[PDB]
């Protein structure tokens, strides 16, 4: 992130339009695609985007997935291990109770039945003090584990956020005093441009992003957006989403610069679903400003 990726985003931000305004619905879905191709024609012609920047994003995205999956497996193995230690820790299940008897009597009888299995008092009543200490320490280590209210994915996300400190990620303060709308000085703007370029249907002799990088690239981009607090802006401001909305409203198909319009929007919808799912997962794992009123002159 601090190296090759930072350089690529810096170079790419300089070839992005200074001001981009989402066209009005009057222009129509066919005309709005022509506006975006002209506005972002530098990014499309760029070649190393699909060779280096995509590769690096896949590396980080795959790493995060590995961290998530390994944590899940560790918990699954950990809970299975704890299940086998229940008899020796006086951990009993909820036994069936029917009319005629109360829970307290049945539980007390069941506990007495399994009393010999319990280890600590058996060593305490008879056994060397060294055995007592070792058994107590072993019992403490076994009972306390990392699936009993402990996680580490949050810490990983926080550390990644700390690694992002260059102002280029967030950009300068907005002139309106609230948020950037038309300016393209934020990373989510570039991710939208990236979404546009790799949502174009490729030819038969070339591979697609999924065939090459899979979901790792999307995971990396969504994580960067989330850690910078720009997920809502990305959803509101997105060239592909705007094109999809207009296409649905009007419903027109036409080949623009050898880029079919229909197949493009379904691809946009599919990636929109994937991005939403990833953002929701990241937000779940991640768990003001007051303006002044006008004053009379």
């Amino acid at each position: 992130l601090q190296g090759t990726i930072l350089q690529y985003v810096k170079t790419l931000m300089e070839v992005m339009p200074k001001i981009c305004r989402l066209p009005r619905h009057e222009y129509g879905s066919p005309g709005i695609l022509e506006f975006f191709h002209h506005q972002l024609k530098d990014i499309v012609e760029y070649a190393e985007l699909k060779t280096v920047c995509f590769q690096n994003l896949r590396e980080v995205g795959n790493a995060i997935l590995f961290c998530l999956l390994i944590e899940q497996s560790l918990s699954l193995e950990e809970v299975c291990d704890l299940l086998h230690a229940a008899p020796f820790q006086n951990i009993l299940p909820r036994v069936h109770v029917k009319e005629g008897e109360r829970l307290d009597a049945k539980m007390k009888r069941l506990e007495s039945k399994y009393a010999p299995l319990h280890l600590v008092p058996l060593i305490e009543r008879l056994g060397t003090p060294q055995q007592i200490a070792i058994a107590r320490e072993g019992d403490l280590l076994t009972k306390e584990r990392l699936c009993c209210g402990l996680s580490m994915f949050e810490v990983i996300l926080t550390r990644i956020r700390s690694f992002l400190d260059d102002p280029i990620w967030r950009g300068p303060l907005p002139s309106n005093g609230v948020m950037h709308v038309d300016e393209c000085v934020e990373f989510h703007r570039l991710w939208s441009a990236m979404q546009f370029v790799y949502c174009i249907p490729v030819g038969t002799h070339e591979f697609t992003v999924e065939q090459c990088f899979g979901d790792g690239l999307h995971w990396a981009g969504c994580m960067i957006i989330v850690l910078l607090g720009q997920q809502r802006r990305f959803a509101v401001l997105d060239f592909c989403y705007h094109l999809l909305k207009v296409q649905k409203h009007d419903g027109k198909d036409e080949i623009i610069k050898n880029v079919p319009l229909k197949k493009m929007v379904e691809r946009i919808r599919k990636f929109q679903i994937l991005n939403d799912e990833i953002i929701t997962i990241l937000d779940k794992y991640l768990k003001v400003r007051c303006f002044q009123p006008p004053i009379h002159q």
Partner: protein, 608 residues
């Protein structure tokens, strides 16, 4: 005694009374509709002869000659009195309410009050609402098909046991036999009231036509878009007619249709009223008297106007309006819902990103909620009724409700920032502007002055330090005082005429809205996005939930339905306490069922 009329207090009290009476009549009609909850004295076959005898002559009472046709009722008079007291007294209260409104309307006519929605919004709104409440109450009464049996049977038992009929019975019987087609008699009764009512209706020409625009105009003017102009989003949205921005369009249609039906004389002369009348007819094909009760407009209007001498043109106009409504109303509302879905989604996301914008752009939130509520109500009442044929079924209402709930949650959570923004607004801007306005008046009395001076002083005292301390305000005094001031200045032979000071009325209305937002956030939310009607449309409520679950795309917004169940307690009135437990129990059941079904669907996907 113009100052002692107290129109403000009378209007606000009677409006609440009318709502309570409407609730009582609706419960009575519902109870007697099914043969399971109606009184046991009307279902027994042995007592059928007495009922027929009383029905044959309801107002006339004859007891000294049984004629062998009534001996059965003699032996159970005591239980009759004990069990039918509730219904008899409820009708009595309706008669008292009817008398009070008639007296108030006559007082308004003699005083020659000035009505204008833009100038005096509160007075005109209360006046029109009261009239519609009175008209709806009579129409609902004319539907309960047993009012005669109850009144006749109860009084007859009272006469037998005591020898004298009820003191207030004859008036009730005379009105019942007089109101068989209530609109027909109301038209004749409202002739003296035509001038005031017509002026108020015509005052809506500046609001109603611009609030009934199609989705194309909304898209052209970028309605409810904070992002469309980025350099002015920090600026506070405001307008001179602030209260009318978030008014219920359904209320306007009810006011227009009922008002011109009673004031049909002015339709031939004036053209603005006729065009406004035409637009209301085209906008809808059925109107909602109370909860599920519905009134068709073209058949009823045609029947009333056919007897008139030379109203053939009006009969024709109703025909074309009916044809246009049935042909285009559904498409127009479908497009409106489509645009609103995106608009609410954009507004909610932007507000979440920048919660501080709620204060300046609070009006946009309330306007969006009102529009969404109007569309939901319109779809819900038309879909069940009006079978013409599919076109009245929407599978994306879940998104609209969910974003309405999201806006409600944002207002609840981010209330303090709105309070701080508007308390500063009142203390800094409104107070100074109001003071220089009042001081630039030719002359004012003591009664009018003591109110204006009190408004300025209350606004100056307000400080931001009282907000973070948890202090709770109470601006009901200012609202009532302004309402009283409107009544005082709206009458004739008044020193300070409100007509010549229209800008003052607009300024006060904006200030009142600011106070309403500061202190009555909950009241504004409920009166803007009320959706308690779903409690009385359970079939559609369940069907929509089932469709939402079936479609994976909308499954994200299935939590809106249980959230809507929380609003079911907002339709209860202190006057009808019996209904509260039944509506409260229904809310708990639906919520549990929805959660269970959602869990069932989840585990089914888990298994697959």
């Amino acid at each position: 005694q113009p100052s002692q009329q107290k129109l403000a207090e009378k209007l606000t009290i009677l409006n609440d009374r009318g709502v309570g009476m409407l609730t009582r009549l609706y419960n009575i009609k519902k109870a007697c509709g099914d043969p399971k909850a109606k009184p046991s004295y009307l279902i027994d076959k042995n007592l059928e002869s007495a009922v027929k005898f009383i029905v044959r002559k309801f107002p006339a009472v004859e007891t000294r000659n049984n004629n062998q046709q009534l001996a059965q009722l003699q032996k159970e008079k005591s239980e009759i009195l004990k069990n039918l007291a509730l219904y008899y007294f409820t009708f009595v209260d309706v008669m008292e309410f009817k008398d009070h409104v008639c007296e108030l309307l006559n007082t308004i006519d003699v005083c020659q009050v000035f009505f204008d929605i833009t100038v005096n919004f509160d007075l005109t709104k209360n006046y029109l609402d009261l009239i519609i409440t009175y008209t709806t109450l009579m129409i609902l009464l004319s539907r309960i098909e047993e009012r005669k049996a109850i009144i006749g049977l109860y009084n007859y038992a009272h006469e037998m046991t005591h020898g004298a009929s009820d003191r207030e019975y004859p008036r009730l019987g005379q009105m019942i036999v007089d109101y068989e087609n209530p609109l027909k008699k109301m038209m004749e009764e409202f002739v003296p009231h035509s001038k005031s009512l017509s002026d108020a209706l015509i005052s809506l020409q500046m609001v109603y036509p611009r609030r009934n625009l199609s989705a194309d105009q909304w898209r052209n003017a970028q309605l409810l878009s904070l992002i469309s102009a980025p350099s002015t989003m920090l600026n506070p949205a405001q307008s001179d007619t602030m209260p009318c921005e978030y008014l219920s369009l359904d209320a306007m249609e009810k006011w227009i249709i009922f008002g011109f039906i009673l004031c049909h004389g002015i339709l031939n002369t004036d053209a603005t009223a006729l065009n406004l009348w035409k637009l209301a007819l085209q906008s809808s094909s059925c109107l909602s008297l109370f909860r599920d009760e519905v009134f068709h407009i073209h058949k009823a209007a045609e029947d009333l106007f056919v007897n008139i001498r030379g109203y053939n043109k009006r009969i024709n106009d109703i025909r074309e309006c009916k044809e246009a409504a049935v042909s285009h109303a559904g498409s127009m509302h479908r497009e409106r819902r489509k645009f609103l879905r995106s608009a609410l989604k954009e507004l909610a996301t932007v507000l979440s990103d920048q919660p501080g914008l709620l204060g300046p752009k609070a009006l946009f939130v309330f306007m969006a909620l009102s529009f969404a509520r109007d569309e939901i109500i319109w779809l819900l009442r038309h879909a069940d009724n009006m079978p013409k044929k599919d076109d009245f079924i929407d599978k994306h209402i879940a998104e609209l409700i969910f974003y309405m709930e999201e806006l409600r949650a944002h207002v609840r959570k981010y209330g303090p920032v709105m309070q701080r923004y508007y308390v500063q607004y009142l203390s800094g801007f409104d107070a100074v502007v109001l003071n220089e306005l009042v001081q630039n008046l030719s002359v004012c009395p003591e009664d009018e002055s003591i109110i204006m001076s009190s408004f300025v002083n209350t606004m100056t005292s307000l400080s931001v330090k009282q907000v973070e301390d948890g202090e709770v305000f109470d601006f009901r005094g200012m609202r009532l005082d302004w309402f009283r001031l409107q009544a005082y200045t709206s009458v004739s032979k008044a020193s300070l005429g409100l007509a010549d000071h229209r800008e003052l009325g607009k300024m006060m209305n904006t200030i009142i809205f600011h106070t309403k937002m500061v202190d009555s956030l909950v009241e504004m939310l409920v009166e803007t996005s009320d959706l308690s009607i779903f409690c009385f449309y359970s079939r559609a409520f369940e069907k929509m939930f089932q469709q939402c679950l079936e479609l994976p795309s909308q499954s994200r917004y299935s939590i809106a339905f249980p959230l809507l169940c929380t609003h079911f307690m907002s339709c209860t009135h202190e006057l009808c306490p019996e209904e509260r437990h039944h509506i409260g129990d229904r809310s708990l059941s639906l919520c549990n069922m929805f959660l269970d079904e959602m869990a069932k669907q989840a585990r089914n996907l888990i298994t697959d």
